[PDB]
Amino acid sequence: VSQVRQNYHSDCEAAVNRMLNLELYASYTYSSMYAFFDRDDVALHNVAEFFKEHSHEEREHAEKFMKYQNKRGGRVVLQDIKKPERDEWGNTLEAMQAALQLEKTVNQALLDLHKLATDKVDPHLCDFLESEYLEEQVKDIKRIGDFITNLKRLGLPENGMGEYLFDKHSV
Amino acid sequence: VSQVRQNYHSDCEAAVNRMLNLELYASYTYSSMYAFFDRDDVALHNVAEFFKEHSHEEREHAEKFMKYQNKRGGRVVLQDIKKPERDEWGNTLEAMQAALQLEKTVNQALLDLHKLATDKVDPHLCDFLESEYLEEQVKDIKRIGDFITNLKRLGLPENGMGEYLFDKHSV
Amino acid sequence: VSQVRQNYHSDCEAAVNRMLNLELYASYTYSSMYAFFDRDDVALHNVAEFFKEHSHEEREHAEKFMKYQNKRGGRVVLQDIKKPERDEWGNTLEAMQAALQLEKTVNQALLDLHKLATDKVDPHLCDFLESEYLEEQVKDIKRIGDFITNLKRLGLPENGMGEYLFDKHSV
Amino acid sequence: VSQVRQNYHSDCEAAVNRMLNLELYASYTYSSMYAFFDRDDVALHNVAEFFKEHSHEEREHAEKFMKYQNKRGGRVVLQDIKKPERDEWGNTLEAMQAALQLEKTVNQALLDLHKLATDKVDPHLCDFLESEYLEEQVKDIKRIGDFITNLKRLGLPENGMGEYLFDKHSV
Ligand SMILES: [Cl-]
Ligand SMILES: [Cl-]
Ligand SMILES: [Cl-]
Ligand SMILES: [Cl-]
Ligand SMILES: [Cl-]
Ligand SMILES: [Cl-]
Ligand SMILES: [Cl-]
Ligand SMILES: [Cl-]
Ligand SMILES: [Cl-]
Ligand SMILES: [Cl-]
Ligand SMILES: [Cl-]
Ligand SMILES: [Cl-]
Ligand SMILES: [Cl-]
Ligand SMILES: [Cl-]
Ligand SMILES: [Cl-]
Ligand SMILES: [Cl-]
Ligand SMILES: [Cl-]
Ligand SMILES: [Cl-]
Ligand SMILES: [Cl-]
Ligand SMILES: [Cl-]
Ligand SMILES: [Cl-]
Ligand SMILES: [Cl-]
Ligand SMILES: [Cl-]
Ligand SMILES: [Cl-]
Ligand SMILES: [Cl-]
Ligand SMILES: [Cl-]
Ligand SMILES: [Cl-]
Ligand SMILES: [Cl-]
Ligand SMILES: [Cl-]
Ligand SMILES: [Cl-]
Ligand SMILES: [Cl-]
Ligand SMILES: [Cl-]
Ligand SMILES: [Fe+2]
Ligand SMILES: [Fe+2]
Ligand SMILES: [Fe+2]
Ligand SMILES: [Fe+2]
Ligand SMILES: [Fe+2]
Ligand SMILES: [Fe+2]
Ligand SMILES: [Fe+2]
Ligand SMILES: [Fe+2]
Ligand SMILES: [Fe+2]
Ligand SMILES: [Fe+2]
Ligand SMILES: [Fe+2]
Ligand SMILES: [Fe+2]
Ligand SMILES: [Fe+2]
Ligand SMILES: [Fe+2]
Ligand SMILES: [Fe+2]
Ligand SMILES: [Fe+2]
Ligand SMILES: [Fe+2]
Ligand SMILES: [Fe+2]
Ligand SMILES: [Fe+2]
Ligand SMILES: [Fe+2]
Ligand SMILES: [Mg+2]
Ligand SMILES: [Mg+2]
Ligand SMILES: [Mg+2]
Ligand SMILES: [Mg+2]
Ligand SMILES: [Mg+2]
Ligand SMILES: [Mg+2]
Ligand SMILES: [Mg+2]
Ligand SMILES: [Mg+2]
Ligand SMILES: [Mg+2]
Ligand SMILES: [Mg+2]
Ligand SMILES: [Mg+2]
Ligand SMILES: [Mg+2]
Ligand SMILES: [Mg+2]
Ligand SMILES: [Mg+2]
Ligand SMILES: [Mg+2]
Ligand SMILES: [Mg+2]
Ligand SMILES: [Mg+2]
Ligand SMILES: [Mg+2]
Ligand SMILES: [Mg+2]
Ligand SMILES: [Mg+2]
Ligand SMILES: [Mg+2]
Ligand SMILES: [Mg+2]
C-alpha cells in the first residue's frame, strides 16, 4: 500500500486508469479530424485547427488524470490507444456530429466515475471531477451543438458555399 | 438561535469546533519541529523553515474555521491546545514520518466532517471542505511522502551526508 | 490521385504512416516514464519532467509527419498506439537505458525511411528527414548516452545518494 | 576554365541556365494573371495581388540561379522569355488550375536538375536545390491545390457569388 494512500478505493483507481485511456482515445480521434481537414481535397484550415486544438486539450486532460493517480497513491496503468473509428470524416457537419457524440461519451464516463466516487464516499475525487472536468465538458458539448445547428442552417452537407462560410466566420 | 443560521446542524457546529482545535494542534506540532531543527546540535535550517511555514499554514487553516463558524451563525468554542507528542524529533526522516501521520490524521478528520455534512445535507459545508481543505491536504501528503522516499534513498537515518544533501537541495 | 501529388511513391507514403505511429509510440513510452518518476515511492521530479518534455517533443514529431503526408498528397492512416513495453521502469539508469534503445529504434526507422526515399529518388523526403529529424535524433542519443555514463559513475542502481544527486544537478 | 570552378559539370551549368529561363517564364505567366484580374471586367483585386506577389517571387528565384551560376564559376547564358500560353485566364478557378500545372512543371524541372546533380556527384548543387527550392515548391503546390478545392466547393466557374467570396476571404 502506498504511504500516501487514504480513502482511495481500488475500483476508483482502476476507473481513473480507464478514464485516462478514454481521454487519450478522444485526443487521437481529434488528431484524425485535424489530418482530414488539412487534406488538399478537403482544405478547411480553420476547421482543421479547431480539431487540432481539441486534440491538445484532450491530451492535457489525460495528463491531469496521470498526475491525479499519483497524488492519491494509485498506480498509472496504460493500455493501447485504439485508432479512431473512421479514417475519413466526410465533411464539417459529419465531423462535428462525431465530435458531439465523442464528447457525450467522455461526459458519460466522467459522470459514471463521479457516481462511483460518490458510492465509495470519495469527496476528493468528486471535487476533482466537478472542478476540473464536468463544466468544461458541458461547455464543449454546447459549443459543438451550436456549430451543428449553424452547419445545418448553412445547408450542409450539400451546400459547399455554406461550408466555406462556416470555416471563414465561425472558427 | 442566530438570525443568520440556516441549515446548520448542531452536530456540524460542534464538529467544526473540534476541527479548529485539531488545526491548532497541528500548527503547534509543526512549531515544535521548527524549534528542534533550529537547535545548535541539529542545525538543519532549511528543514526548520519548512516546518515553520507549515506551522503558519495550519494556524491560517484554524482561523478560516473560526470565520466559517461565525458566517454560519455557529459559535466558536475553544479548548486547550495540547502540546506535541514529542519534545525532540530525532532527525529529518523521523520528523517527516511524524508529519505524514499528522497530515493523514488531519485529512481523516476533514473526511469525517465531510461525511457528517453529507449526512446532515449541508452542501455549503461540503463545498467549503472540498474547496478550501481537501485538495491542499492531498497535495501536502504527497509532498511529504515524496520527501520520505528521498530521505530513505539518501540513507537516513544513518547517512549524515544524505541528511545534509537533502537540507541543501530539497527544501 | 491527389492533385498535388508529384514524385511521391506509394511505398514512401505507407512508410511515413508507419513512422508516424512509431513517433506516437515513443511519446507514449516517455509519458509512462514521466508517470513512474512522479510516483510517491519513486519521487524524482526533475527526471519525471525530463521524460514529460520528451513525450511532448515526440508528439510534435508525429504531428509534423501528418502535416508532411498532406503536403505531399498522401493520406494519413492511423493505427493503434501500442502501450509501452513496461509498466514500471526500475530506476533512473534503467529508464535512461530504455530511452537510449527507444531513441536508437526511432533513429533506425528514420534511416530506413531515408534509404527508401533514396531508392525511390525522392529528394524532398530525404531533405525533410535530414533537416527535421536526423540531427535532433543524434543529439538526443548523445545526451542520453552522457546521462547513462554519469548514472553509472554515480553508482546506479545501488547508490541512492547518486540517484538523488543526478536528479538535483543533471536535469 | 574559371579559377573558382570545382566539381561543376558542363551539363549542370547548362541545366542551371535552362532552369533560370523557366523561372523567368513562370514569373511572366504570373504577371499576365495579375494583369487579367486587374481588368475592369474581371476586377478581383485580391486575386490579382496574389499573382503579382508570385510573379515577384519567381523573379527572385531566377536571380538566385544567376548568383548560383557565378558562385560555381559557370556562365549565365540568357534566352528569350516566352510569352505566357494564354492572353486571358477565364476566371479564378481556371487561373489557379493553370498555376498548379505551372508549379508542377517548375517542380519537375527542379527534380530533373536534382537527378542530374546526383548523377554528376554534385552535392553542393543538390543541397542548393533542397535548401532553397524544393520545399517552397511543395508548399506552393499545396496552397494552390487547397485553393482549387475551395473554388470548386464555392461552385466555380458558374457561381459568381462564390468567386466574390473567395476573393474576399481566402486571399
Ligand atoms: Cl485507501
Ligand atoms: Cl474516510
Ligand atoms: Cl487498471
Ligand atoms: Cl502537457
Ligand atoms: Cl486494449
Ligand atoms: Cl472511414
Ligand atoms: Cl471543469
Ligand atoms: Cl446562513
Ligand atoms: Cl439551522
Ligand atoms: Cl435545507
Ligand atoms: Cl463545541
Ligand atoms: Cl492569519
Ligand atoms: Cl482539553
Ligand atoms: Cl520526546
Ligand atoms: Cl483545498
Ligand atoms: Cl492522500
Ligand atoms: Cl506521384
Ligand atoms: Cl521525378
Ligand atoms: Cl499506410
Ligand atoms: Cl502540437
Ligand atoms: Cl496495431
Ligand atoms: Cl513492468
Ligand atoms: Cl534535425
Ligand atoms: Cl567552387
Ligand atoms: Cl569543374
Ligand atoms: Cl569531386
Ligand atoms: Cl546554356
Ligand atoms: Cl530582386
Ligand atoms: Cl528561345
Ligand atoms: Cl487566350
Ligand atoms: Cl525551399
Ligand atoms: Cl507536391
Ligand atoms: Fe474537447
Ligand atoms: Fe481543459
Ligand atoms: Fe476530455
Ligand atoms: Fe473533449
Ligand atoms: Fe474545451
Ligand atoms: Fe501542512
Ligand atoms: Fe492553505
Ligand atoms: Fe491544516
Ligand atoms: Fe497540514
Ligand atoms: Fe500546504
Ligand atoms: Fe526525444
Ligand atoms: Fe524537435
Ligand atoms: Fe521522435
Ligand atoms: Fe526521441
Ligand atoms: Fe530532443
Ligand atoms: Fe510561386
Ligand atoms: Fe522564395
Ligand atoms: Fe520558382
Ligand atoms: Fe512558383
Ligand atoms: Fe511561395
Ligand atoms: Mg486495485
Ligand atoms: Mg475505454
Ligand atoms: Mg482495432
Ligand atoms: Mg450524496
Ligand atoms: Mg458534492
Ligand atoms: Mg466544488
Ligand atoms: Mg468550476
Ligand atoms: Mg449545539
Ligand atoms: Mg481533537
Ligand atoms: Mg498532557
Ligand atoms: Mg479546488
Ligand atoms: Mg499506396
Ligand atoms: Mg511500427
Ligand atoms: Mg498488446
Ligand atoms: Mg545517392
Ligand atoms: Mg542528399
Ligand atoms: Mg540539407
Ligand atoms: Mg540541420
Ligand atoms: Mg559547358
Ligand atoms: Mg525551358
Ligand atoms: Mg511564340
Ligand atoms: Mg529547408
Short mmCIF file of C-alpha atoms in Angstrom, two decimals, chain A residues 8-132:
data_model
loop_
_atom_site.label_atom_id
_atom_site.label_comp_id
_atom_site.label_asym_id
_atom_site.label_seq_id
_atom_site.Cartn_x
_atom_site.Cartn_y
_atom_site.Cartn_z
CA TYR A 8 -8.90 5.73 -2.29
CA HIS A 9 -10.77 2.62 -3.40
CA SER A 10 -9.20 0.09 -5.78
CA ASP A 11 -12.30 0.43 -8.01
CA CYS A 12 -11.78 4.20 -8.29
CA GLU A 13 -8.07 3.77 -9.06
CA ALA A 14 -8.96 1.34 -11.89
CA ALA A 15 -11.73 3.62 -13.19
CA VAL A 16 -9.28 6.57 -13.28
CA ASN A 17 -6.97 4.45 -15.46
CA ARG A 18 -9.83 3.67 -17.82
CA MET A 19 -10.83 7.35 -17.95
CA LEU A 20 -7.18 8.24 -18.79
CA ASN A 21 -7.35 5.86 -21.74
CA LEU A 22 -10.60 7.40 -22.98
CA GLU A 23 -9.13 10.92 -22.88
CA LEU A 24 -6.20 9.67 -24.98
CA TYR A 25 -8.64 7.97 -27.37
CA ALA A 26 -10.54 11.25 -27.72
CA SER A 27 -7.26 13.13 -28.36
CA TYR A 28 -6.34 10.67 -31.13
CA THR A 29 -9.76 11.00 -32.75
CA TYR A 30 -9.44 14.78 -32.84
CA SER A 31 -5.96 14.46 -34.36
CA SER A 32 -7.50 12.32 -37.11
CA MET A 33 -10.07 15.03 -37.81
CA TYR A 34 -7.26 17.61 -37.95
CA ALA A 35 -5.44 15.45 -40.52
CA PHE A 36 -8.60 15.09 -42.60
CA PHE A 37 -9.43 18.80 -42.80
CA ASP A 38 -5.78 19.53 -43.72
CA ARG A 39 -6.07 17.29 -46.84
CA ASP A 40 -5.62 19.16 -50.14
CA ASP A 41 -9.02 17.80 -51.28
CA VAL A 42 -10.79 18.97 -48.10
CA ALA A 43 -8.84 22.15 -47.29
CA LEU A 44 -10.74 23.73 -44.39
CA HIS A 45 -7.79 25.01 -42.38
CA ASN A 46 -9.74 26.78 -39.63
CA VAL A 47 -11.80 23.65 -39.02
CA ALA A 48 -8.57 21.61 -39.02
CA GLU A 49 -7.04 23.93 -36.40
CA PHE A 50 -10.18 23.69 -34.21
CA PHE A 51 -9.78 19.91 -34.05
CA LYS A 52 -6.00 20.19 -33.55
CA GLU A 53 -6.58 22.42 -30.52
CA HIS A 54 -9.18 19.99 -29.13
CA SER A 55 -6.70 17.13 -29.60
CA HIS A 56 -4.16 19.04 -27.49
CA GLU A 57 -6.79 19.82 -24.84
CA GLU A 58 -7.73 16.11 -24.51
CA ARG A 59 -4.06 15.14 -24.13
CA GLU A 60 -3.85 17.65 -21.26
CA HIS A 61 -6.98 16.09 -19.68
CA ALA A 62 -5.22 12.72 -19.83
CA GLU A 63 -2.03 14.05 -18.21
CA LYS A 64 -4.11 15.57 -15.42
CA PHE A 65 -5.53 12.09 -14.63
CA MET A 66 -1.98 10.67 -14.50
CA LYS A 67 -0.97 13.36 -12.01
CA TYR A 68 -4.19 12.72 -10.06
CA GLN A 69 -3.49 8.97 -9.84
CA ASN A 70 -0.04 9.58 -8.38
CA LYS A 71 -1.26 12.24 -5.93
CA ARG A 72 -3.71 9.72 -4.44
CA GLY A 73 -1.13 6.90 -4.33
CA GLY A 74 -2.75 4.91 -7.12
CA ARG A 75 -0.68 3.47 -9.94
CA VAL A 76 -0.94 4.56 -13.56
CA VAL A 77 -1.61 1.54 -15.79
CA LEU A 78 -1.65 2.27 -19.52
CA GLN A 79 -3.38 0.38 -22.28
CA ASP A 80 -3.31 0.64 -26.09
CA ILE A 81 -4.78 3.82 -27.55
CA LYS A 82 -7.26 2.49 -30.12
CA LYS A 83 -7.26 4.14 -33.55
CA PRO A 84 -10.25 6.33 -34.38
CA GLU A 85 -13.47 4.75 -35.67
CA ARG A 86 -13.13 6.38 -39.09
CA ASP A 87 -10.22 7.13 -41.43
CA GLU A 88 -12.11 9.91 -43.21
CA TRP A 89 -14.71 12.26 -41.74
CA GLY A 90 -16.94 13.25 -44.68
CA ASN A 91 -17.36 16.98 -44.15
CA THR A 92 -17.60 19.61 -41.40
CA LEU A 93 -21.13 18.57 -40.34
CA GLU A 94 -20.31 14.84 -40.17
CA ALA A 95 -17.15 15.55 -38.18
CA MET A 96 -18.95 17.87 -35.75
CA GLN A 97 -21.68 15.25 -35.28
CA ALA A 98 -18.98 12.68 -34.48
CA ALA A 99 -17.30 15.14 -32.09
CA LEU A 100 -20.60 15.76 -30.29
CA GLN A 101 -21.09 12.06 -29.78
CA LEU A 102 -17.49 11.64 -28.63
CA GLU A 103 -17.84 14.49 -26.13
CA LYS A 104 -21.07 12.95 -24.77
CA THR A 105 -19.31 9.57 -24.46
CA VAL A 106 -16.49 11.22 -22.49
CA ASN A 107 -19.07 13.09 -20.40
CA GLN A 108 -20.95 9.87 -19.61
CA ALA A 109 -17.73 8.23 -18.47
CA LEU A 110 -16.96 11.24 -16.24
CA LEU A 111 -20.47 11.07 -14.76
CA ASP A 112 -20.11 7.30 -14.22
CA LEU A 113 -16.77 7.90 -12.45
CA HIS A 114 -18.45 10.57 -10.30
CA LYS A 115 -21.19 8.09 -9.36
CA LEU A 116 -18.53 5.52 -8.40
CA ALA A 117 -16.67 8.13 -6.33
CA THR A 118 -19.98 9.02 -4.61
CA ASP A 119 -20.70 5.34 -3.88
CA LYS A 120 -17.21 4.85 -2.40
CA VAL A 121 -17.51 8.11 -0.40
CA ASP A 122 -14.54 9.86 -2.03
CA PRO A 123 -15.16 13.62 -1.94
CA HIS A 124 -11.68 14.48 -3.21
CA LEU A 125 -12.33 12.56 -6.43
CA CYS A 126 -15.84 14.04 -6.68
CA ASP A 127 -14.41 17.57 -6.27
CA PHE A 128 -11.68 16.88 -8.85
CA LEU A 129 -14.21 15.81 -11.48
CA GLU A 130 -16.56 18.70 -10.72
CA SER A 131 -13.81 21.35 -10.62
CA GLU A 132 -11.62 20.16 -13.49
#
